[PDB]
Design a protein around this nucleic acid. Structure first.
Ligand SMILES: [K+]
Ligand SMILES: [K+]
Ligand SMILES: [K+]
Length: 180
DNA sequence: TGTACAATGGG
């Protein structure tokens, strides 16, 4: 019952689970956001992932869970200001893609937050294997993030199905690495 | 590349 860990569990416990309908709606928004981000990259000559990360950094203020173990830190503030500057200065026709991209990353963050409880339930099955509980959570969280990136809502499978696959993969890979 | 029943206290 690590104080910081107990506090994380308390915090993710307040995030309600998504209904099927909401799940589909968020996943749809993430897809649309990635397509818009592609367009912004073509227009600006900037890396898609760099655009995504900056757009994310600008929607985190409205987020429910701020510090999530295992998640990539925001880029340095100067990179943010610079890239956010270029995106904001784009012509009318392109600024709608920016709106769609912002909606997508806001949706991604929500979808991730609403599944942190699943990561924890799986992690509990892997304790005493060389990684601390907190470490299991960090690795599981990175599997969750990968799940979100590759999830295809059109297959009509529940998100928990695909996330479980990835969270186990990530945790198993981390355990095998620790072991050498 | 692709990785997919559901699973979020546990069984
Ligand atoms: K019961
Ligand atoms: K009970
Ligand atoms: K029961």
């Amino acid at each position: 019952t690590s104080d910081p860990v107990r506090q994380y569990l308390h915090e993710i416990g307040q995030v309600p689970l998504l209904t099927l309908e909401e799940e589909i709606d968020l996943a749809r928004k993430v897809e649309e956001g990635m397509e818009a981000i592609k367009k912004l990259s073509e227009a600006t000559g900037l890396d898609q992932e760099l655009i995504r990360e900056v757009v994310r950094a600008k929607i985190l203020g409205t987020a429910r869970i701020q510090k999530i173990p295992g998640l990539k830190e925001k880029p340095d503030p100067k990179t943010v200001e610079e890239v956010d500057g270029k995106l904001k200065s784009l012509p009318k026709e392109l600024k709608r893609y920016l709106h769609i991209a912002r909606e997508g990353e806001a949706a991604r963050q929500h979808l991730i937050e609403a599944n942190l409880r699943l990561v924890v339930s799986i992690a509990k099955k892997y304790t005493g294997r060389g990684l601390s509980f907190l470490d299991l959570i960090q690795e599981g969280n990175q599997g969750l993030i990968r799940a979100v990136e590759k999830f295809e809502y059109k297959r009509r499978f529940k998100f928990s199905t695909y996330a479980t696959w990835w969270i186990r993969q990530a945790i198993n890979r981390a355990i095998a690495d620790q072991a050498r």
